[model samples]
Target: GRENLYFKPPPLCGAIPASGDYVARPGDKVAARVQWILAEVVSYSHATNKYEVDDIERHTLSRRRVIPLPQWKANPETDPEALFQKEQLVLALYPQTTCFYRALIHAPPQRPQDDYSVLFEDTSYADGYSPPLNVAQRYVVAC
Candidate 1:
């Protein structure tokens, strides 16, 4: 057996994980925050957990900024499932630092409440053991 994830390919569903970070994957739409441009995930990076997306503003801005999936529920621009289970983990935007941090489901019960809670705790920002992150971060579960 081997122990390094140096080079590999993301699965068809992209790196969704339990928290559902939305690593946009291929053919999916996303909002490039830097410029507020709606874009599509064209290429995904297995090593960096990043995505190279193309948007309407490509001519003005580079179409290839290393991006990761958005952790907010408002993202996706289409579709549903705006819930998380207690005990699940999610990547949250740390207000103080304004960076994505890892958070856990501090509460309990059911098929919903990790990132959607009112509060959260911090943890390691490392990736994972499974291919492209098996399970799933931080600011806090929204209350």
Candidate 2:
């Protein structure tokens, strides 16, 4: 049996989430970076940027996870690929291929939007690939 499930596109600056303007709450699955599993927007503070999130798999209280929003519009301009390491394993969300997959950082390109040469773990390649999607890009990465 197959189900015709529909998946909305990820969030972007100045645009409501593809699921509509769903205000993330204590247990809502937030599409965020540094998320081990499906992170939850535990608490939100409108006055600031960071929205404390967590992945309470055991129903634990939560951590002080001030996760950043995927808003390149307002984020400060910094290194194109901050903290990116060569040969580091990263979680990537390639819309053209699949939802989430492991990839490697092959190079530190000068381009901001597509900064790295990512090679998917399952499929090996030499160069010319999309940079690994991070927090600002709206792809979920593990902690």
Candidate 3:
């Protein structure tokens, strides 16, 4: 009876690095900032282990805070079971923006043609309560 409500961590789809010393190269896309936004790699410093990325504006990030994004997208038709779970953290492209932001899954797609409902992290909210919105399957990735 409780099978429908079972909970589990989201699948690791290679969007997140498995090792701490994962190297990012220039011209590659990366997730950075404590706020977590998609940024383009500009340079890296081995001595300080810092990354210089441009998320529209240039910002320097430490190794631990920067992560490389997945190069491919998820297909709902072929991988319907690969959907993210509720409350799972993810990287989703914000509406009308080219960059992706960290968000939590509010609800997974209920139908094959439906998109995901996610809560995006925003500092403007009083309690950091992300406002929920629908995101396309292709635009959402594992964080």
Candidate 4:
């Protein structure tokens, strides 16, 4: 059987070049931070007829970005059993960084509800995962 599910933000990268961090850009690297998570659209695609989430995260590095959730198998062997136990799943994306966080709950489903809300409600800023400053420090630190 599945158990209660929870989510935790991944470690910050800390500092990446704004103009050019990767081979495409220039300069050693600049500091980039993730700010907030936002839920934009949630609906069932007529083509797939599956629950879909269109979410965005506000960022200090740039503007709000969008993310989508696709159905996939949850590994029972490698992945924790708790993840599949929940009735709701929230997907979070770092505003500045490309990192993602997920939250699962055993509660009843909400009408016109998106998984983003579930994550936002349960998470605390004090825990270092809040919107508009969810992750204050830069993910990519100086080398």
Candidate 5:
């Protein structure tokens, strides 16, 4: 019964690169840190027609199942320039964690090849730990 309570990792949170770097593409790895809310599953409900032989059951659930949290989204217009400038600065400042802070490059459909875009997705940090002050690393990777 306890094992059933366990859940797999959330679908990587946002868009990720599809290949080359981590997965199969660039977008499969990059995840936009946008603002959103997460709703917890409280319960379920069922219904049936009165004429039918079946019965209807309504599962009472908690109303306070939704929680809002802020997410970090890279500014599309400024992301390219920022990505390069920030990466270079951060790399020079913190050589040890250079690998930890790299941009996820992507080539949009409209501007394929000629226009390569980059976005920041995941950061360097051990699961369940606070991200470093300088970098926006995640505290935990898995629950």
Candidate 6:
């Protein structure tokens, strides 16, 4: 009798190894720097774990400071948990601006058609207070 091999697949949630490195390639979309702004990768160094990105200017960022944006958008109806959670820090595209900015989720969508409520970090405010605004899930990504 021949023995049958059984194989099990890994969990779908956050599908990746914790020990492996996520290498970014040229022309990849990513969030970088302390501000978590959107940028395009120009080059990467495996030895230094650094990325040279263009974000309205040329700058280098450490691997720790760079996060690649998801190629697909999550649907709230089918995968709300997969989307950014409340109080979760994220990089979101700000209105009236062409760049992405760091923001904190104030509340998740209550209705299927609703967007996320987020508080963006404003430099002009004395206490860093910005009125909560609704941002479409398409414009939000993990930071």
- Which candidate's TM-score is highest? 6
For model 4, residues 40-113, the per-residue Cα lDDT tens digits are 34433335433333333312222112222221222233333212233344433444544445533333212112
**How do all the candidates rank in terms of lDDT, highest first?**
3, 6, 2, 1, 4, 5
Model 1 off-target regions past 4 Å?
Answer: 1-82, 106-115, 122-143
User: Taking the tens digit of each residue's C-alpha lDDT, what string does model 5 give over 1-143?
Assistant: 00111211222221211121212121112111112111222222334211111011212222222111112223333333212232221111112231223333332212111222334344443442223233232211110
Q: How many steric overlaps does candidate 3 have?
A: 0
Candidate scoring better on TM-score of 3 and 4 = 3
Q: Write one digit per residue (lDDT tens) for candidate 6, span 10-104.
A: 12222111123566679977667745677889999888888899983888788888766654433445555555677888777786554778888
Whose lDDT is greatest here? 3
Question: On a 0 to 100 scale, what is the lDDT of residue 73 in model 6?
Answer: 37
Q: lDDT (CA) for every model shown?
A: 0.37, 0.42, 0.69, 0.28, 0.22, 0.65
For candidate 2, write residues 1-143 as lDDT tens digits. 11111232234331222333334566665445443344566666555635565643322322333322233321113333333456766554554432455666565434434334556555333564444443323442332
Error of 2 at 84 (Å): 1.5
Sorted by TM-score (best first), the order is: 6, 3, 2, 1, 4, 5
Tens-digit per-residue lDDT, 43-133, candidate 3 = 9999999999998489978888776764433444455456778888988888777667888999877555577898998888996757889
- Model 4 misses residue 132 by how many Å? 9.9
Q: What would the C-alpha RMSD of candidate 1 be, to one decimal place? A: 13.9
lDDT of 4: 0.28
Poorest lDDT segment (10 consecutive residues) of candidate 6: 1-10
Worst 10 residues of 1 by lDDT: 129-138
Model 2: lDDT to the true structure: 0.42
- Assess every candidate by TM-score: 0.28, 0.36, 0.59, 0.19, 0.15, 0.65
lDDT of 5 at 111: 17
Error of 3 at 52 (Å): 1.1
lDDT of 1 by residue, 1-143 (tens): 11112222232212232234435557655444452334566776566655666663332223233234434332211212233444556544444343343555443222222223323342232342111222222123322
Clashing residue pairs in candidate 6, if any? none
